[PDB]
Amino acid sequence: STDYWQNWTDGGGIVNAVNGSGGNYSVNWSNTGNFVVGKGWTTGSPFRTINYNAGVWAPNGNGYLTLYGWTRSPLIEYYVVDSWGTYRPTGTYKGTVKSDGGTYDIYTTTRYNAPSIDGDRTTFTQYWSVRQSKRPTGSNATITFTNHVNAWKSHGMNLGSNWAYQVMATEGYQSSGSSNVTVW
Amino acid sequence: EGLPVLAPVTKDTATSLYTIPFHDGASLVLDVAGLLVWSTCEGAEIACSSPTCLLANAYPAPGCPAKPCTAYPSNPVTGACAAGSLFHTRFAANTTDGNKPVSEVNVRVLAACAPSKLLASLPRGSTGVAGLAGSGLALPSQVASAQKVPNKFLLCLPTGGPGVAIFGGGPLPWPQFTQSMDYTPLVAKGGSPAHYISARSIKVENTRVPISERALATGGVMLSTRLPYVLLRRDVYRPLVDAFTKALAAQGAPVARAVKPVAPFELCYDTKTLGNNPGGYWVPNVLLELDGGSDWAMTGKNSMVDVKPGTACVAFVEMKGVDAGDGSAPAVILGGAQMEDFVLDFDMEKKRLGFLRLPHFTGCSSFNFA
């Protein structure tokens, strides 16, 4: 069960995020620039099984329903995107992995003098597993994060040895939407 | 064809100026308010009575006064200027479909020669300046008529890695994002090439900075790539800075520690006492509410300059030599760090600036050739 809460907006539009009971959170948002809201854990782990139930996933425009987090040593950001809005994020293709009833494509992207957990001006690679089509929502859903870790490792994408936050998030941008997500 | 023309944009680390490749592994400094393309040369004809020439000297730059065409290139950092004449040269880049570089192209353009002493304080490897302000001899207007495309340019300045300059219209890049680009008029000012937009109000966090009725004039916000930071007139500086510091002091964030002010910033901090979030340093969000009903967000990555390891300073600096509400001077000059990771469409034909802050998980440097 969760111990980490994330609620960031860039100030655009209206973003009403609720830190509900246990692992539950909701966001209703409109006319946004950009926000990320979620719950997960202060300390990520490559062996975690994330369970979540997204009782509402109702984006109008760009939005991502994703597990995401960081390592240091080295500094990596990673994403497991189970659903989205109007656009499906991609990047440099690396491979595909079957996990939890879905097929995901694996992508890398790179960020230069960009924000991170290490500062305002930092350099890092991002790793992505993005499902091929939107995962159905409304039922309990599993992300067996090891499957993703192993598949990334098999394609030369090694994570850092030390694990910082790991959250089941709602990211929204230039859009409106509602999300209601319960994590355990 | 008549296809738009793409160049990658480098943020030079030592200067914080932005350049684009020009020819021969030499580069020019993007200067959004600049009127000319100029560079040094090796050792082209046009009369100084000609419309071209007269237009090139129609708004004499600060230090400078006013038979072959003598033009008057200036350095955007120092303000030095110099006589030099016009010569045909080649701007080597690629055409674009909007998403990637397609084919190489040399665009015939007119530049002024400048003496080498004019390169002062510009980036290593730079031989001059790509003036972008709407005009005759600016780079976008010449690319337009040289390639038969719109007099329109697009910038996506990077924090690091190659960003994007597209001259001539065409589809917007990042079509997944830019379908929702917001738009604000380009306001005409007297005697002045430059790029001006209007903001009704500035917000710090959720609350309006008490600044007049109309001191954020019509066209009271200028864009420039000459500084990394934002310049504010007296009547905007104190109130914006005050609101920013009170909101800073209200943050579950670390308690920020003030450190030895580094010039020209008169407000710096130790980075180990600033938090970090997806916006960059955890300091208040500052939004310009622009004509058009859309806000220009600034977060930490825009509002704070990493001056040296351990210190970061608020990137609002006061204009010196200036009265409060001196109409001639803009109320806010927004700098390069306030435009990084914005897709900026400068549409001179329709008198509008498209702007879109790209999502926090990408940036201008994610453009390209799979």
Swiss-Prot record, chain A:
Residues 1-184 form the GH11 domain. One of its GO terms (molecular function) is endo-1,4-beta-xylanase activity. Keywords: Carbohydrate metabolism, Glycosidase, Hydrolase, Polysaccharide degradation, Signal, Xylan degradation. The active site is at residues 77, 171. Its EC number is 3.2.1.8. Pathway: Glycan degradation; xylan degradation. GO terms for biological process: xylan catabolic process. It catalyses: Endohydrolysis of (1->4)-beta-D-xylosidic linkages in xylans. Pfam families: Glyco_hydro_11. Disulfide bonds: none annotated. Belongs to the glycosyl hydrolase 11 (cellulase G) family. This is Endo-1,4-beta-xylanase A.
